[PDB]
Design a protein around this ligand. Structure first.
Ligand SMILES: O=P(O)(O)OC[C@H]1O[C@@H](n2cnc3c(-c4ccc5ccccc5c4)ncnc32)[C@H](O)[C@@H]1O
Ligand SMILES: O=P(O)(O)OC[C@H]1O[C@@H](n2cnc3c(-c4ccc5ccccc5c4)ncnc32)[C@H](O)[C@@H]1O
Lengths: 142, 142
């Protein structure tokens, strides 16, 4: 029922439209707890949220614990995304990472190297394929 | 005795000289398990290590478990650094994050928000202060 979606925010918003596409597809497979990550309206570098980073942190950890599945778009380097994956691994959550090699980047060894091909999966994709990728995973997931 | 140092690699090498300064100072407080992170010679985007990301991942997790203290320079956004901090938090390691506001960046809410001011600390510093910062922490640490 519950999906935790991770994507870069203060690591930068370059991929925001992709996060929106990902979140949209995910809604047919479950409740997306993190949907705000995909919001085009959200741009930071303000410093707001009025509850502070502490509130953000605690609220997210609560959602991460509820999550049946964790999905991360790992193309844009982000401390927050890495942290969430680290916490998720320790919680024993099934995890799907999606990476775009077409970005010219090489994915982090700690992310790529964390993959077992089962409970932690990393999929390389081309931008137009992302729905199919999500479809494969979640159909298989049953 | 044992310090795990985290710094960006595939997130980018901009701060490499700082990592070297940090690692150098840390050696008087203990064995630095991760010292290679500070190496100027290390530049990636190759894709090497010949043992693969899996080997890198497992070797680092072994070191992280041995570590008495985790120190991270969090100024440059990195998935790997975030991941290491996430794993370290779950292992209950004391943690010191160092951040430079002079970089113009705003630090990740998940990192800043993870801080309790005791077992997880985040210190803002100016580049010339980093030795003093490390000194404060480790003297206090006894
Ligand atoms: O910011 P990053 O790139 O280090 O990490 C992004 C990841 O960490 C989580 N995260 C990071 N910043 C978040 C925020 C956030 C950040 C900055 C803000 C600034 C102004 C107003 C609201 C804000 C909310 N809200 C919710 N989750 C967040 C999030 O789930 C995402 O997956
Ligand atoms: O690469 P990032 O920025 O996502 O994460 C950097 C963090 O994650 C760890 N880490 C990341 N890449 C690492 C490597 C590594 C990466 C790429 C390489 C390429 C060619 C040859 C050797 C390599 C070694 N070795 C050891 N630790 C690494 C490291 O401890 C550091 O703190």
């Amino acid at each position: 029922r519950s999906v935790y979606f991770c994507g870069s925010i203060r690591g930068g918003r370059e991929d925001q439209a992709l996060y929106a596409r990902i979140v949209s597809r995910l809604r047919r497979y479950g409740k997306v707890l993190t949907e705000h990550v995909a919001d085009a309206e959200l741009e930071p570098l303000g410093e707001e949220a009025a509850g502070g980073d502490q509130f953000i942190h605690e609220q997210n950890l609560n959602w991460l614990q509820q999550a049946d599945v964790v999905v991360a778009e790992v193309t844009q380097p982000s401390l927050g995304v890495g942290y969430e994956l680290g916490r998720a691994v320790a919680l024993g959550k099934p995890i799907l990472c999606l990476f775009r090699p077409q970005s010219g980047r090489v994915l982090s060894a700690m992310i790529r190297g964390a993959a077992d091909g089962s409970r932690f999966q990393v999929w390389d994709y081309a931008e137009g394929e992302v729905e199919t990728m999500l479809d494969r995973y979640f159909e298989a997931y049953l």
